[PDB]
Design a protein around this ligand. Structure first.
Ligand SMILES: Cc1ccc(CCc2c3nc[nH]c3cc3c(=O)[nH]c(N)nc23)cc1
Ligand SMILES: Cc1ccc(CCc2c3nc[nH]c3cc3c(=O)[nH]c(N)nc23)cc1
Ligand SMILES: [Zn+2]
Ligand SMILES: [Zn+2]
Lengths: 357, 357
């Protein structure tokens, strides 16, 4: 395979479906990336994560540089062999999860240069530029300052990546658009990033507390500003319905800790909306978590049993809920892909919503 | 298969190897039974428990009658379908895990009759008589009182089981020898139990704080008192070396929460003795937990990674350590079985010990 090739196989409206080919495998888009916060997708073996249909996972720089240590993982062979996942890994830059801020970077040390170096040491396949994610709400002046800084850091990221030849030849680099909710700042940011040139473009600074209406409004004008022929990654999104509407607005890649996090908390996703399995109404319910789901959890165990496990604080409860939720998300992404390929995604999006709600 | 058939295929000294055939499957002896305390073997799917080589698991009456409730599990189809384990399950009687004691039973209500009924409601394949496990140390008078009570309760257990025809035709009933460390009381108990007649005989009242020397001394005279042609179950034992010496003394069946419990605590069993994976010396060790182990954990992940997970409090750490430990115990039981079958168990027991220590 190539270092990086994104191909769009089909389109409907602003929605797109295709593939990203990379040396460690192919990524079907639109894609959902399970998140691994300390070199593990919580409560799942990597073979299980793959069995749910994931093509790529998101690795944790913030956690990893602290524990176990970037240099340490490199000494041990890199993150892929360390955790036992041999397919692509996207790493965030640490431009969110972290203090003392300056133009050089953040100490708590992290700079564009060190962030790119850490992602190299981890053996990341998709490296994210080091940015500043602008708090919400933000005034226009502060959003501009933060965006401008991020754009200077994006150039420094680009140049750090390009000077390290093994990284430049084997990994991909994504830039991150900032500008909070302001169209003119989003446009300046997009233009700056396109001028520098990246392999893919994230929409940053969303999923920071704004509502779905506001996030969608900002996507409406923001995503068309990005190069059409490169992937569009919406960081930190989201709920199933957030995902469907973001695809309707041109997003190709997603990550969210919801399916894992909330799974362990008792929330299960179903085509009829989320349920909380701790609720007493499930104590004697012999049905699977979701009536259509093809996952191994729904083939084998009842709501009543998973209810019992989560109430009892049993580790298997976390395991099963997380496997189901991540399988659910992958089935959603597959339905999205197939429906765009068949020119019926807007109908799918409506059917989905009428039932989920 | 039959309701119950124990066949001894080979012997060496007091050690024996063979099979227990039951309707839900065959149990290879000497056997190690993983313990499930709330209708789950902690951190393992039942398919994983089976893959490690377990033929039977031990189900938790004390926990189960409290949560989720015996009647509830029965309403839901029984423990086997509830937890997704279709092979034999041995249930303890609640004669250990629980108050106010009287000749009728214990309230906290549990009586011989109710214990046998709960095990029926759970769908247990091997039902244990309801007993009183005598604290250690115990004076001769108190050990005698407790043993005598247990023997009266053993008759009540026998008769409760026999009057319930579905249970009597499909499950097996084991009696439990008491008498603390006193030979004459162990003999009275054995005789009482043989007179009543059971499908198998546990050695109770050990693993209650006495040392290995004392436990072995009591086994030396206690196990030959039991019927030779029925299985001998040593409740709550134990460490690998406890298991080898107990087999040398005629025990056929074992349960212990050590491999699970201590696994989650960072202790891993190896042929060179136990290690604690939290120790800093493992942070960069690329070797598997044990150099010979055939388990999937040792095929795929390093000490350094499992060290990282357990230090980080990651659920996958508990999963992997528990899978390894239970696989380790099953490999031990297989080496024991094969060595008795080949007439070289006493040599195996020596080689084992010289290396483990
Ligand atoms: C494990 C892990 C990976 C990534 C993250 C933060 C990921 C994340 C966002 N999540 C929600 N909204 C987000 C916005 C940004 C952003 O603007 N820049 C960056 N670099 N990351 C973001 C947190 C944890
Ligand atoms: C899940 C679970 C199953 C079984 C048990 C207690 C199991 C157990 C013993 N464990 C160590 N020593 C033991 C002695 C006895 C005994 O004398 N009688 C009974 N009924 N159980 C014992 C505890 C937890
Ligand atoms: Zn499912
Ligand atoms: Zn192993």
């Amino acid at each position: 395979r190539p270092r990086f090739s994104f191909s769009i196989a089909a389109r409907e409206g602003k929605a797109r479906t295709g593939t990203i080919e990379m040396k460690r495998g192919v990524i079907r888009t639109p894609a959902f990336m399970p998140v691994g916060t300390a070199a593990t997708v919580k409560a799942l073996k990597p073979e299980t994560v793959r069995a749910t249909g994931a093509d790529i996972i998101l690795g944790n720089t913030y956690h990893l540089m602290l524990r176990p240590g970037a240099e340490r993982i490199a000494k041990l062979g890199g993150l892929h062999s360390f955790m036992g996942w041999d397919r692509p890994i996207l790493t965030d830059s640490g431009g969110y999860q972290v203090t003392k801020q300056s133009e050089e970077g953040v100490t708590f040390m992290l700079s564009p240069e060190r962030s790119i170096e850490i992602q190299h040491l981890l053996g990341s396949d998709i490296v994210m530029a080091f940015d500043e994610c602008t708090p919400y709400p933000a005034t226009p002046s502060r959003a501009a300052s933060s965006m401008e800084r991020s754009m200077r850091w994006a150039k420094r990221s680009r140049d750090a990546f390009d000077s390290r030849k093994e990284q430049a030849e084997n990994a991909a680099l994504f830039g991150i658009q900032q500008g909070s909710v302001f169209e003119n700042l989003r446009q300046q940011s997009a233009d700056a990033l396109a001028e520098i040139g990246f392999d893919g473009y994230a929409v940053g600074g969303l999923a920071v507390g704004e509502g779905q209406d506001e996030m969608f409004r900002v996507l409406d004008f923001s995503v068309p500003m990005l190069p059409d022929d490169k992937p569009h990654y919406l960081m930190g999104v989201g709920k199933p319905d957030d995902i469907v509407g973001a695809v309707e607005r041109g997003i190709d890649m997603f990550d969210c800790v919801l399916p894992t996090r909330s799974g362990r908390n008792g929330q299960a996703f179903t085509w009829d909306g989320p349920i909380n399995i701790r609720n007493a109404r499930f104590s004697e319910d012999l049905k699977p978590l979701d009536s259509e789901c093809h996952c191994a959890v729904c083939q084998k165990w009842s709501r009543a049993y998973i209810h019992h496990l989560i109430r009892a604080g049993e580790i298997l409860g976390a395991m099963l809920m997380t496997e189901h939720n991540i399988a659910f998300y992958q089935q959603l992404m597959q339905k999205i892909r197939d429906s765009i390929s068949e020119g019926r995604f807007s109908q799918f999006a409506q059917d989905f919503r009428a039932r989920y709600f």
